[PDB]
Design a protein around this ligand. Structure first.
Ligand SMILES: [Cl-]
Ligand SMILES: [Cl-]
Ligand SMILES: [Cl-]
Ligand SMILES: [Cl-]
Ligand SMILES: [Zn+2]
Ligand SMILES: [Zn+2]
Ligand SMILES: [Zn+2]
Ligand SMILES: [Zn+2]
Ligand SMILES: [Zn+2]
Lengths: 348, 346
């Protein structure tokens, strides 16, 4: 049960197929309760999963490395996060902190969610009220299959994943390995992915696009769970009758922000229900549509909504977050366009 | 020169410095990066006018490397410039321009003598009673007494006018030697005489500060930023503008229980009509008032039933639970007595 420093963390988590990370602090009484329990689970599991990088338990002293904790937006202790090959999973571990409960959790997360087809007839009897994604491969031992198996482990909660190999899948491989999305119901045709199947990012992107919405609604009921995903929010606040704002926002996010997809969460929020957050940026529902970023540290305002129509402005807003420009302008006021400087401000 | 400060050396360096100006910065703050040459230039200007060791000390704190020092002084944005006197942080933070002149003029005014010496005791009879006045009658200016007086006046000159009388002049009022006398506002208010040991800084400072600064202040839209800049958490009373009874109770109970905590907490009271939004943060409304809450700038913690202030020790325990981390633990994990995960609110 390893300890992650600011230098060895990327090496360790990337090489771990599954890693359960304990983000703790010494002053958290509940953190100290966990260290023996996290050790015992670590050994119960180290025996059931002996091989190198099958399951890897680590921990992060969030006092020592405030930057690491800031990276995954850890704000309270202890917080247990799941990583697959160095990528944090949306769903935080919120089960009980018992040696038993941790072990059962790792047990599930290590189970194979992919159903292997043994006869192509099975595809005609799939449950069409769920979404189904079928991967047709020459062989299971292929870079193609390994990318697919990664995507399936990340997304099994969102979609059913199936596989077929060799002689079974040959009739569907006229043009090589491919992936078929069977949409729910009977109203749309299958979509076929014949692209960069060794490319995790592109393949993950296409599959994920089929089974989670690009812009989700944040509500009181799902806010905490969305915060637990570890990313800042890019939010459109808008009235329910206001469908044009959402349409514009959805299109500009889809056109401009695909490369940023995994570093920020795209959300929309009913401005009547979110009157209080709108206060924090000196807005009322009458002011909507409003675009804002919520970095958890602060909430930053985009400007006139009609500026989303200007090409690249939405991208630049996201870029200004990650560059630190939005934070700087929040305490120090707008950067110069092209005498001596004032003190930083609480809100400005 | 600009001294870098870590945890191993922070208290030594600032304690020995009669005046220290500290630059709390962060490498990623562009205004911090701009400040570093101006800060070095200002210390060089001031090291010329103030040569002796610990006359004026310019130092800096990389708040990334030393998050705990930053937390100690409630630094939350950069660059923040604080003034210390012999290790004690002055409540007013440096808010002037970050230029060499503005810095230098500020250090020059802080080093200046704020006490006015009176040539004739006729000046105390004609003394302006629209103000708080403290008068020190001394044997000589080379006293140890006067140097404690000088130390207190340097800290509290913004809160009170300090006058001194020496030698032949003060001789009549020194029937019993050196003595300090407070003249409250209004020609009708009686004099209150200091009785403690004038060579004792801690004791003379506390008596003078009690006559100078009210124990409980009202936080308003105007002074909100200033109060935050004092670097102390808030123990605040939310009451209606007409609810004077709750306020009197609060002031009494604070004076009875919390004088030990006077330097670590800011005692405040606020009109809950004009602060409806912060009350909303603790699931309270003006109807729910009176409310007692601590604002720790991380979170806001509710005391419970306002009736419980009258139970001896319960208000003191509220503050103790803040410093012991108990309030923060219970905020994320629920009341103290396998484990449930932490929550952002319970
Ligand atoms: Cl915590
Ligand atoms: Cl900044
Ligand atoms: Cl800053
Ligand atoms: Cl805690
Ligand atoms: Zn907290
Ligand atoms: Zn905790
Ligand atoms: Zn609020
Ligand atoms: Zn900030
Ligand atoms: Zn800054």
């Amino acid at each position: 049960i390893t300890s992650l420093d600011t230098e060895n963390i990327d090496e360790i988590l990337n090489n771990a197929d599954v890693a359960l990370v304990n983000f703790y602090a010494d002053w958290c009484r509940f953190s100290q309760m966990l260290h023996p329990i996290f050790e015992e689970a670590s050994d119960v599991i180290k025996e059931e999963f002996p091989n190198e990088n099958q399951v890897v338990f680590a921990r992060v002293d969030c006092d020592q490395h405030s930057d690491i904790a800031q990276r995954y937006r850890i704000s309270k202790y202890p917080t247990l996060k799941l990583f697959r090959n160095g990528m944090m999973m949306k769903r935080e571990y919120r089960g009980q902190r018992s040696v038993k409960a941790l072990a059962d959790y790792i047990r599930q997360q290590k189970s194979d969610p992919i159903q292997e087809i043994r006869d192509l007839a099975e595809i005609t009897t799939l449950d069409r009220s769920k979404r189904n994604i079928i991967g047709y491969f020459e062989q299971k031992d292929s870079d193609n299959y390994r990318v697919f198996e990664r995507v399936a482990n990340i997304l099994h909660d969102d979609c059913a994943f199936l596989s077929a190999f060799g002689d079974v899948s040959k009739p569907e491989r006229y043009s090589g390995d491919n992936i078929i999305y069977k949409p729910p119901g009977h109203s749309a045709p299958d979509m076929v992915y014949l692209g960069a199947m060794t490319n995790f990012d592109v393949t993950y992107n296409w599959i994920q696009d089929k089974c989670v919405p690009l812009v989700r609604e944040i509500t009181f009921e799902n806010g905490e769970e969305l915060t637990e995903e570890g990313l800042p929010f890019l939010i459109l606040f808008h009235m329910k009758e206001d469908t044009e704002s959402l349409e514009i926002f959805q299109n500009e996010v889809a056109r401009q922000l695909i490369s940023e997809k995994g570093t920020i969460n795209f959300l929309h929020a009913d401005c009547d229900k979110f009157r209080h957050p709108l206060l924090h940026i000196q807005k009322t529902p009458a002011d909507c549509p409003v675009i804002a970023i919520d970095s958890f540290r602060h909430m930053y305002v985009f400007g006139d909504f009609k500026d989303v129509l200007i090409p690249g402005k939405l991208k630049q807003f996201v870029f200004d977050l990650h560059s630190g420009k939005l934070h700087r302008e929040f305490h120090h006021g707008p950067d110069p366009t092209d005498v001596a400087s004032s003190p930083p401000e609480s809100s400005f």
